[PDB]
Design a protein around this motif. Sequence first.
Motif, PDB file in Angstrom:
ATOM      1  N   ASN A  28       0.852  -1.166   0.000  1.00  0.00           N
ATOM      2  CA  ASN A  28       0.000   0.000   0.000  1.00  0.00           C
ATOM      3  C   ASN A  28       0.897   1.227   0.000  1.00  0.00           C
ATOM      4  N   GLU A  51      -8.411   7.609   5.733  1.00  0.00           N
ATOM      5  CA  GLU A  51      -9.453   6.578   5.746  1.00  0.00           C
ATOM      6  C   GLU A  51      -8.880   5.274   5.207  1.00  0.00           C
ATOM      7  N   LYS A  52      -8.081   5.387   4.151  1.00  0.00           N
ATOM      8  CA  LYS A  52      -7.470   4.163   3.575  1.00  0.00           C
ATOM      9  C   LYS A  52      -6.464   3.532   4.551  1.00  0.00           C
ATOM     10  N   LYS A  55      -8.351   1.495   6.987  1.00  0.00           N
ATOM     11  CA  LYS A  55      -8.776   0.221   6.407  1.00  0.00           C
ATOM     12  C   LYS A  55      -7.643  -0.792   6.401  1.00  0.00           C
ATOM     13  N   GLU A  56      -6.381  -0.337   6.438  1.00  0.00           N
ATOM     14  CA  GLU A  56      -5.234  -1.266   6.547  1.00  0.00           C
ATOM     15  C   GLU A  56      -4.773  -1.452   7.986  1.00  0.00           C
ATOM     16  N   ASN A  57      -5.543  -0.934   8.939  1.00  0.00           N
ATOM     17  CA  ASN A  57      -5.227  -1.044  10.365  1.00  0.00           C
ATOM     18  C   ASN A  57      -3.874  -0.438  10.672  1.00  0.00           C
ATOM     19  N   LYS A  71     -10.461   1.978  14.591  1.00  0.00           N
ATOM     20  CA  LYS A  71     -11.442   1.365  13.705  1.00  0.00           C
ATOM     21  C   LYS A  71     -12.196   2.372  12.865  1.00  0.00           C
ATOM     22  N   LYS A 167      -2.693  -6.247   9.557  1.00  0.00           N
ATOM     23  CA  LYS A 167      -4.094  -6.547   9.878  1.00  0.00           C
ATOM     24  C   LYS A 167      -4.422  -8.047   9.884  1.00  0.00           C
TER      25      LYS A 167
END
Length: 167
Positions: A28, A51-52, A55-57, A71, A167
């Motif tokens: 990423n 935000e992205k 989503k990858e923690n 989260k 993740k």
Amino acid sequence: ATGIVMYGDETGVQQTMDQYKDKIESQNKFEAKLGTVNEKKVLIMNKTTAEKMVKENMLKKVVKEDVEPIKALPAISDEAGIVFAKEEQKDVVIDGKKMKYEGNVVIGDARKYTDMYAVVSDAEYAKISEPVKTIGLASFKENPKEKIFPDIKRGSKVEEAHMVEVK
């Protein structure tokens, strides 16, 4: 841990991914701008990017001597960007805008490459003149800690790198 978070110029991050491409299962790339505020470094990203990262923690709250991925990204708006730092910081001004403190959250498993992290709206980010940097996450097929990681650290392609739990 089988992940490595790296920071630097896009070309250096990309060259590193390329070097280890057959060893990497996923990656990423996130863009940010590295600046200073009050003699401290601040890594600024836009809402879409942050935000992205969630989503990858990859944005993680510091808890005791460990970390826990957030989260949800706190609300961001043009009138209210946010800042993450070790201590409460209510006077962080970026491009004439005061950030709202949102806690001790870091990228990956430790505070690396910067002192603070800021998230602003996509429109606000567009106006920031600071140098763009790339934050890269590479998830390795197998444990890269014993040879790959130190080679990345000894190298001159990226500015900083650390091992992280993915993740």
